[PDB]
Amino acid sequence: VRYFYDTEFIEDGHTIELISIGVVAEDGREYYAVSTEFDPERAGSWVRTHVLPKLPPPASQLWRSRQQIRLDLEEFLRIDGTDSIELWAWVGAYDHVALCQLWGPMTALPPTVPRFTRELRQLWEDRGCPRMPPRPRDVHDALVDARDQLRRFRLITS
Amino acid sequence: VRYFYDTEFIEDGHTIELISIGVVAEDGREYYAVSTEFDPERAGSWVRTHVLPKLPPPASQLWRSRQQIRLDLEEFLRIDGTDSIELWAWVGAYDHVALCQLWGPMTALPPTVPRFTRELRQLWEDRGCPRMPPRPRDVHDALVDARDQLRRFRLITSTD
Ligand SMILES: Nc1ncnc2c1ncn2[C@@H]1O[C@H](COP(=O)(O)O)[C@@H](O)[C@H]1O
Numbered sequence: 001v002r003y004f005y006d007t008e009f010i011e012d013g014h015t016i017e018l019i020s021i022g023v024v025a026e027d028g029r030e031y032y033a034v035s036t037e038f039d040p041e042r043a044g045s046w047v048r049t050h051v052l053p054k055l056p057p058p059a060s061q062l063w064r065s066r067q068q069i070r071l072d073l074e075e076f077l078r079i080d081g082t083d084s085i086e087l088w089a090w091v092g093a094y095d096h097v098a099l100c101q102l103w104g105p106m107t108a109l110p111p112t113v114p115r116f117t118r119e120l121r122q123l124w125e126d127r128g129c130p131r132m133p134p135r136p137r138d139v140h141d142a143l144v145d146a147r148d149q150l151r152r153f154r155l156i157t158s
Numbered sequence: 159v160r161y162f163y164d165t166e167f168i169e170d171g172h173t174i175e176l177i178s179i180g181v182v183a184e185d186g187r188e189y190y191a192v193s194t195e196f197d198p199e200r201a202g203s204w205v206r207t208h209v210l211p212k213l214p215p216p217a218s219q220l221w222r223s224r225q226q227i228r229l230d231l232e233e234f235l236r237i238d239g240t241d242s243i244e245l246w247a248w249v250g251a252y253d254h255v256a257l258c259q260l261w262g263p264m265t266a267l268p269p270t271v272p273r274f275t276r277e278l279r280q281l282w283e284d285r286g287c288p289r290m291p292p293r294p295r296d297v298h299d300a301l302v303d304a305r306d307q308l309r310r311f312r313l314i315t316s317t318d
Pocket residue numbers: 006007008009010011046047051139140141145264265
């Protein structure tokens with residue numbers, strides 16, 4: 001049913017070039033990958049500072065082509081499976097576009113992937129902004145961030 | 159406080175090329191603009207059939223440059239006024255990026271404009287999936303669509 005995701009990327013007002021994506025399922029399963037296809041030379045100061053140094057070493061099998069990440073997510077999200085799929089992120093408009101663009105134009109998204117991502121900050125506000133734990137030390141690592149979103153959701157819906 | 163918006167665009171898996179944007183305020187004010195900068199020749203069949211035919215005539219003042227649209231939104235949203243801005247759309251990921259891209263990168267969004275758009279489809283489910291009126295005939299006209307979102311918002315929230 002529910003997946004919580006977050007991405008890092010280099011975005012210049014025109015494209016969103018995926019660096020990494022973390023996805024964590026309410027059931028416990030976790031997926032993380034880093035694209036071998038973004039150009040680190042195109043990163044701005046902020047991304048160079050906060051994002052790139054947290055990436056796995058270059059030898060890690062966590063580094064994957066975009067075709068591999070798409071295929072990995074079709075499996076991970078169980079797109080062919082029995083359960084309905086619900087995607088969640090925090091303040092995730094660009095995250096949703098980054099995800100969908102692994103498949104192409106919005107058209108190309110598998111029939112069972114939702115055409116919207118539920119906005120965890122909206123749920124949080126709707127429930128009176130209950131106290132959340134402080135942000136993890138390793139923010140801007142997309143798996144750490146994705147994990148933190150499931151944590152928040154569990155707390156909010158507790 | 160609250161603004162309801164919709165956008166039309168040509169999206170290709172790489173970029174989102176803005177066609178038009180409609181914004182309606184809770185107070186009754188309305189804004190609509192069609193960009194002079196997108197290339198209608200890229201549009202696919204669906205956009206050609208459902209979007210382009212609804213655009214104003216060539217000489218309408220509704221046609222504006224992207225820089226003028228940004229300027230018009232800074233004023234329309236009252237970005238220097240004291241109200242906090244809340245933006246809402248229905249199934250609004252691409253709309254939010256299209257809106258925010260009138261300022262360029264994330265970096266450049268005026269600090270008073272929220273970094274997220276509230277998802278009206280998400281609020282609808284949360285409030286028990288109330289039966290809604292049908293969508294208007296003239297859907298795919300961004301101002302029509304924006305107006306209809308403020309309408310559904312008022313109906314969804316009427317006993318909150
Ligand atoms: N303060 C910021 N300055 C510049 N880019 C940012 C900033 N916050 C977020 N981003 C961009 O948004 C992506 C997702 O952000 P996050 O999930 O906060 O790490 C980052 O990889 C950057 O491209």
